[model samples]
Target: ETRELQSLAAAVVPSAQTLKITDFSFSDFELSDLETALCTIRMFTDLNLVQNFQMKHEVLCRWILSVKKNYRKNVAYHNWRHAFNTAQCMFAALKAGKIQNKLTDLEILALLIAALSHDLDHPGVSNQFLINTNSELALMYNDESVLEHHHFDQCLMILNSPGNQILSGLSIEEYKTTLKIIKQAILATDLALYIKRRGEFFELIRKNQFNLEDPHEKELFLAMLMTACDLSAITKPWPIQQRIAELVATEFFDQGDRERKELNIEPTDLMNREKKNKIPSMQVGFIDAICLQLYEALTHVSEDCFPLLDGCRKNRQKWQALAE
Candidate 1:
């Protein structure tokens, strides 16, 4: 693993072990899982999070490994790779989007860890299915953001697990505040909640009151950024976007399969395997409804985020062409 790590280091980092700031938004698809872990650490270091947070480098490595390991492999899209990519996009947003200066160090750490832990231990099913199937998690969270609540619990469990306490050096109050931020960040990743909050976020932006100092407003802002990073697969280059759409479809279709077999119900056209050929056209609708506004709002926040808007538009055109 160490030998492979070194070669991957050469690929991601031109110098031995240090990663300098570069156009990190490009070609993030090439990396082994281990390399992604190393890349995660490098991002932490590059952001000065390691120094500012006083996290022990070795402990942070252990924490990253544990977090990645906790992402169940049975899930297709919301697995370790997805979590890593989410964090990487957040890294690029803060670095390349030039928005890092807007956040406190603790906020940055909170957002990064939240991205890494957002989809931990997914069972390859949506919260609706879990609620319909009468699963324990649905009961546990009372049918509200069920998967998200479980993710936050799993994140906390892993963070407090043996040798994975990377936040050990944080003071009592700082640690408490960090946990609060992390909890909100993870909970905000529920795509259902995101849509509702997105309107309010853009309303705040449209009304010109998006200050980051107000605690509630900051939460809303950070939550919006979380969705941007989580759904950022739509903002990647065409090949990566198409590949991720396949993975997501496979995962969603699995849930639809269960709904048919177990719940004795017909899945929607978007999720039904019989309607798989509709995906390209479906992609067009998804982009227009869900993606375009968010990226446009992000551009309003920081014009540096325009590339995401640009990528979404380009892919939408490609999907539209295929649909036509």
Candidate 2:
């Protein structure tokens, strides 16, 4: 009965997507509303001035809406809505002075768009799922940042859609640069890889490398902020933050069930194990790494991130207490 229900649901809604692509109509209000939400996010990139900002915004919105079309039925945790939320958090972090540079409207928009488009067509599984299941995404990405690479491919593939021709307005150089930044920034969201690199990268910044003048260097700094913001629930609006944690936990539990069934192992069934067992330790570790990345950028720039940082710490404690 459960299998039959799952199959039936799959036919109509393969994942967490409750709406079909054809169901979405971009009336003028919808278009403007989405663009407005996205434009506000563009204010956090701290990029040097450039024109044709609206072009990027259009591309981003199209990419987001495209994901809804392609995988709304299958996406649950990392759907278009989650993308928008993360983008909102990205800008929130910037607005609260967490980012090093005071981003222009255009840059923040790009970041928000990137965030919104980052998880297009996610299959409700982690990178390890592809490897274990021998999924096409794993093979195509060569098991490299498996889920992250999938998100990138998904972003580019959908961006090639006719409705997503935002880059067409830019010069070839500008187009390439924009694509490059988006690609790098999106790929950096691979938490496993970032965790591995966080140690060395943190140490490098601790040494005050290059006095942090280069935009690329600054971007890497911002990438960590964005990545942290994407994962750091404590930094969000309280109600929304709790809601996301519940959504993410549900997703995690679902994935855990699949893992247990596939491996034929007894399910431990603890979704927030790390949060439960090692909250304080993990909190300190993440803070150390996050601050190491942010402080350097803040030193050379104007963004003040103390509020978000403090909020993150507080939330960590709250979760820890709950677990206890």
Candidate 3:
């Protein structure tokens, strides 16, 4: 075999994942990698979505494997596990919180895709770092929400690959709707979008003007839900939350170190190893700045989200204690 040209005629075959999936907390961790795939399959089935759209379940399993496969090997915090954890927030927010009753099957499917693929191929660096360095993705996205766009792009790539065509079952129109929702949900993870769009959500809710069934309101709700799940790591029990913070800080320091070495720039305090002790204070600020308000508004929408809100508050108290 010559090493010059890549093969053009060989048919591609995709495989599944491994490791057993046992019952595990969405807040904690998992049983196995393969189990994650199986569980994901069930996450769909649980939504009363079997044999609809003429979808084949095995390829769904097949697709999950590639999704897990391409999540990137090691990037510290933004790795496959983070994607799984984020998806769990959606599951907990939907099934466990009994909120799925309001969403259509396609919406549920799209949200699931949104959560799992939201951070695809993440480089474990902040979007600002990418823009500052003129990374290829930055130029491609014109320096606006670069990471989010790449994630969505990579997600679409996997979807089109052999054995990963999970959405092939949908009708042409249904496919577009699902992709539309998926795109919105993925872009929504950008905190920039969250900040710009989140204000009207609560105000509308407070004034009883929010129509859950309206297309616009539903998009807002799903976007906010995606954000909630994106930051759901903060809602885990303190021990778990604490561990996640370390992973996050580790990734931040990595980028910070890169900034120092490559960009010859001073890293942000949170990213600087010297100020690692600031994590607790930063955590508290993060919760206060975003978590409390979002989860609280979510609770008003559905009391079942109280656990997420409760966990969020408790984490703040723990971080507050450490910050002192």
Candidate 4:
């Protein structure tokens, strides 16, 4: 295992150094391309504060590679590639969006790591599916952010494994703080939570109550940022956005198929494959209702995120044209 990991690390390190985290696209990579995912993650970490914590590259690389392996499930989407993309989007937001200036190095590190692991071990099904099916994960988590809680626990399990202690170098206080932020960031990817918090975030912005100095407010800001990064495929170039929409729809339909076959329950409109043609309209609705508002709120906090808003608007128009 060590030899294989070493060989994989060596092969990817060079390209990893050259790949720009902000501009790189995952379109050319296969869904299960562990090497590229590792390279991208390594590069992002190297450029960020992960190295500042005295984490050994070998440990980090091995741990991330293991993380990639855990994502190699039978799911259509929400796989390792989606996890990689989410991390990349977070990296872009921190770098290009210039939000890093407002964050401590520790906060930035937690955000990136959480983004990469947010969807770890996803079953390609919604939380409602797990609840309705009475799955072990749902029961274990008490049906409250079941998948997100499971993902965070899975991340900790991998981190606690022997030689996989990528975060072992941190002091006890730092470790606890980092772990807290990571947990919050991971859970923030839950769209249901995002929907609930979205109004509060906008209201805070409207009232000019956003204060970076307050830890609680900062947590809220980071949570919103995590959601924006998680759904950033909507703000990509039109072609990429369209492709991701199709992939997401494919995953939804797959889950719908499972629900129909095993539970004998009809899926929601968005999940039903028969409604696939409405995908373009669905994309528009998602952008208008979710993506645009998040990005717009981001711009209010940091104008550097304006490009995200622009990409979102352009993609929405394209989807609108298709829907028409």
Residue 114: error of model 4 in Å?
0.4
**Candidate 2 TM-score over all chains jointly:** 0.71
- Could you tell me which residue pairs clash in candidate 1? none
- Which digits, one per residue and each the tens of the lDDT, describe model 3 over residues 1-324? 211111211212222112111211354353455445555665655555556655675566666767787786668799888888787678767866777987988999899888999999998898999988889999999998899999999999988998668788788998999999999999999999999998999899889997887899999999999998899888877778878888999999999999999999888898999888889899899899988999999888888888889989999998899899
Which lDDT tens digits does candidate 2 get at residues 1-324? 334323322332121112111111111123333443333223322222225344554444454445555555554467656665566556555544534255544455456557766776788877877797898888988998887777777777766777666456666766676677677778878876567656654665567563345676656665665576566554544555566656666676677678777866543434343344543455456555564344343333433545555555566566556556
Better of 3 and 4 by TM-score: 4
TM-score of each: 0.93, 0.71, 0.90, 0.94
Q: Considering summed lDDT, which 10 consecutive residues are worst modelled in model 1?
A: 13-22
Give the range of the ten consecutive residues with the poorest summed lDDT in model 2.
19-28
lDDT of 4 by residue, 1-324 (tens): 677678666664544435656552435354336555555556556556565888776777788778888885788779887888888877777777788889988898888789888988998999999999899999998999999999999988988988779789889999999999999999999999998888878998999988889887899999999998888887888778778877888899999899899899878888899878888888888889889988999999989888778889999999899899
Alpha carbon RMSD to native, model 1: 2.9
Question: What TM-score does candidate 3 reach?
Answer: 0.90
Q: Which of candidates 1 and 2 reaches a greater lDDT?
A: 1
RMSD of each: 2.9, 9.6, 5.4, 2.0
The lDDT ranking, best first, is 1, 4, 3, 2
Give the best candidate by TM-score.
4
